[PDB]
Design a binder for this molecule. Structure first.
Ligand SMILES: Cc1ccc(CNc2cccc(C(=O)O)c2)s1
Length: 291
């Protein structure tokens, strides 16, 4: 799958909030463009003169992540984070010259991302009480991946000693996105586990943190909540469910061609980190069928 690469796969079935450290530093920001940040300002001004109701918003930037030696005690992951914006995204990753900026970054900084906003996304593998994952159909009128299948998530907005607060807002924001889009009560959801980080090679390498969340409702009760909001309660245009049994081979189905890259990352990491049984009991051939 050329349109998604794994930057990180978490150990132990995924990491809770308490085993993650963040470092939020202006050293983790995008570098100023070789010819000045004027190019981003020009693209923004042009866009507002066609859509004057658009507004900017701050975003987190992923610079890098380091995993501890496996089986160790203490914090297991460090996230190195800066700040970016929707405006900087439109002028870099979403720019037609995005591939030229990646080449210039390799040359100048030995880093394909050095000149890119790279806003951090979040997505969820959301499992029901009756063992399904939750999918959403994207509107055909949106800018990115129109009409494709997605999972719940989005792009959290800011606001280890400021670090711990940053880690809490990331985990809080995946739950809030599930409540806003799927119309579920907060109290039907587990604390999320981080499965890993996935890069969207169709959006110049920007990264999404991918999480596992369990709901205490069945698929049928999840569907009821989603629909009972009506058309204005959600950006998506439909909800559907796949048994966890059948998620194992999803990359061999006709659905795979309709999944947006960030939802591909969520399913690949769910299959590696929550599936793939390591032990003699869940490993047995009747429970884990060959081929
Ligand atoms: C900071 C974000 C990363 C990706 C986002 C999704 N929305 C989007 C994508 C591509 C163009 C546009 C537009 O408004 O042109 C919107 S939001």
């Amino acid at each position: 799958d050329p349109e998604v690469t794994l930057l990180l796969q978490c150990p132990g079935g995924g990491l809770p909030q308490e085993q993650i450290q963040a470092e939020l530093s202006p050293a983790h920001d995008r570098r100023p463009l070789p010819g000045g940040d004027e190019a981003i300002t020009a693209i923004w001004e042009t866009r507002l003169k066609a859509q004057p109701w658009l507004f900017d918003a701050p975003k987190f930037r992923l610079h890098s992540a380091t995993l501890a030696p496996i089986g160790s005690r203490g914090p297991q992951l460090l996230l190195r984070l800066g700040l970016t914006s929707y405006r900087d995204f439109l002028g870099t990753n979403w720019s037609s010259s995005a591939a030229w900026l990646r080449q210039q970054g390799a040359t100048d900084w030995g880093d394909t991302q050095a000149y890119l906003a790279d806003p951090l996304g979040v997505g969820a593998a959301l499992a029901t009480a009756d063992d399904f994952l939750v999918f959403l159909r994207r509107s055909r009128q949106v800018a990115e991946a129109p009409g494709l299948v997605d999972v719940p998530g989005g792009h959290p907005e800011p606001q280890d000693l400021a670090g711990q607060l940053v880690v809490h807002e990331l985990f809080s924001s995946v739950l809030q996105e599930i409540c806003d889009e799927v119309n579920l009560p907060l109290l039907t959801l587990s604390q999320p586990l981080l499965l890993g980080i996935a890069r969207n090679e169709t959006s110049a390498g920007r990264a999404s943190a991918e999480f596992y969340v369990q709901c205490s409702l069945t698929s049928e009760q999840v569907r009821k909540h989603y629909l009972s909001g009506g058309p204005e309660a959600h950006e998506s245009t439909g909800i559907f469910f796949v048994e966890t049994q059948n998620v194992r081979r999803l990359p061999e189905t006709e659905m795979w061609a309709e999944l947006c890259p960030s939802a591909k990352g969520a399913i690949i990491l769910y299959n590696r980190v929550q599936g793939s049984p390591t032990g003699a009991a869940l490993g047995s051939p009747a429970l884990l069928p060959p081929l």
